[PDB]
Amino acid sequence: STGSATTTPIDSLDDAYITPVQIGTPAQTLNLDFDTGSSDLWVFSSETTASEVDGQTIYTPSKSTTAKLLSGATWSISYGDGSSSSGDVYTDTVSVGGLTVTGQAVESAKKVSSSFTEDSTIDGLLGLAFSTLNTVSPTQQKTFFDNAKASLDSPVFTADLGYHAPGTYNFGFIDTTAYTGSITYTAVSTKQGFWEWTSTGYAVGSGTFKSTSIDGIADTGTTLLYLPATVVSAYWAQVSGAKSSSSVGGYVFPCSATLPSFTFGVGSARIVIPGDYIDFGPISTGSSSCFGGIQSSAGIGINIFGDVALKAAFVVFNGATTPTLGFASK
Numbered sequence: 148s149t150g151s152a153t154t155t156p157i158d159s160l161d162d163a164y165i166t167p168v169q170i171g172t173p174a175q176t177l178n179l180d181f182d183t184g185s186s187d188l189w190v191f192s193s194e195t196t197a198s199e200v201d202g203q204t205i206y207t208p209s210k211s212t213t214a215k216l217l218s219g220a221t222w223s224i225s226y227g228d229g230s231s232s233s234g235d236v237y238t239d240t241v242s243v244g245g246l247t248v249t250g251q252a253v254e255s256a257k258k259v260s261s262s263f264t265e266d267s268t269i270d271g272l273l274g275l276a277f278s279t280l281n282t283v284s285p286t287q288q289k290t291f292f293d294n295a296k297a298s299l300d301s302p303v304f305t306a307d308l309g310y311h312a313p314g315t316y317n318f319g320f321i322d323t324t325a326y327t328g329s330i331t332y333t334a335v336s337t338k339q340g341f342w343e344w345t346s347t348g349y350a351v352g353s354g355t356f357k358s359t360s361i362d363g364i365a366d367t368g369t370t371l372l373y374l375p376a377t378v379v380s381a382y383w384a385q386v387s388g389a390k391s392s393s394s395v396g397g398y399v400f401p402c403s404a405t406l407p408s409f410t411f412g413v414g415s416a417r418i419v420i421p422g423d424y425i426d427f428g429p430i431s432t433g434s435s436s437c438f439g440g441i442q443s444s445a446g447i448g449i450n451i452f453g454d455v456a457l458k459a460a461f462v463v464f465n466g467a468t469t470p471t472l473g474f475a476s477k
Contacts, residue, residue: 186276193206196259277290305462333413398442
């Protein structure tokens with residue numbers, strides 16, 4: 148089997164991407180944030196505290212003939228941005244782009260933090276990291292990809308995120324028309340439950356490439372590119388007037404600037420992030436100070452290849468017995 152679904156930016160900055168997902172019988176379609184940095188599929192629901200729901204589409208398990216309470220199971224998650232959610236669990240039929248999993252754990256939110264309430268466009272998350280990170284207790288549950296894996300033509304999914312445009316998540320096959328050149332594959336460590344890999348270095352603009360190992364995760368659920376402070380400083384030094392602002396919470400730059408590209412290494416191959424991808428616009432409406440798309444990972448504890456990086460590539464998440472990651476230009 149295979150599946151193929153379009154993923155759409157939630158706003159003009161590509162702050163995140165939503166992908167339609169069918170849950171239950173008859174289908175209830177919710178727009179979920181596919182997140183290769185976590186492993187829970189959770190939704191706004193008929194059980195979510197009413198004051199915490201504001202415009203989202205909810206899953207109502209009582210209206211699904213295939214929904215079954217997973218008795219005794221609860222979940223609770225916190226993300227890197229300080230947001231959180233928790234609730235109980237149903238199993239139900241879940242389909243993405245024509246690919247159907249029966250008995251998928253659908254984690255129903257009873258509580259969500261304000262960040263989620265405030266974002267009307269995201270109805271929940273669909274985790275695509277390794278199932279070892281799944282928070283369901285007392286019986287840990289499998290991700291959608293984990294459940295689908297054995298049935299897939301090939302045990303892979305791909306992320307093809309657009310810049311200010313829709314893109315595609317495919318399951319079970321590699322679309323050879325979707326990228327240029329060849330795909331370069333690189334080793335993955337699953338020891339922390341992430342799609343963790345080592346970049347071979349970087350360049351700033353037309354500068355010379357610096358060979359240096361940068362361990363990080365491929366995370367579709369993080370907006371920006373978070374790299375070591377040395378690397379980030381080297382980038383922003385090439386932008387007149389750019390500075391790290393403690394009050395704003397990162398590097399800002401004059402909105403009148405032209406940003407240089409940023410290149411990262413995948414083995415001997417190179418992925419170029421155009422300068423425009425690194426512009427996240429005025430820090431506040433009408434401001435001439437713009438927020439940067441490359442930020443320091445210091446104090447996160449891990450480097451994160453988020454959407455800024457990933458949308459510059461066609462990315463293969465290879466879930467073979469020994470997982471790997473592939474990157475191609477496009």
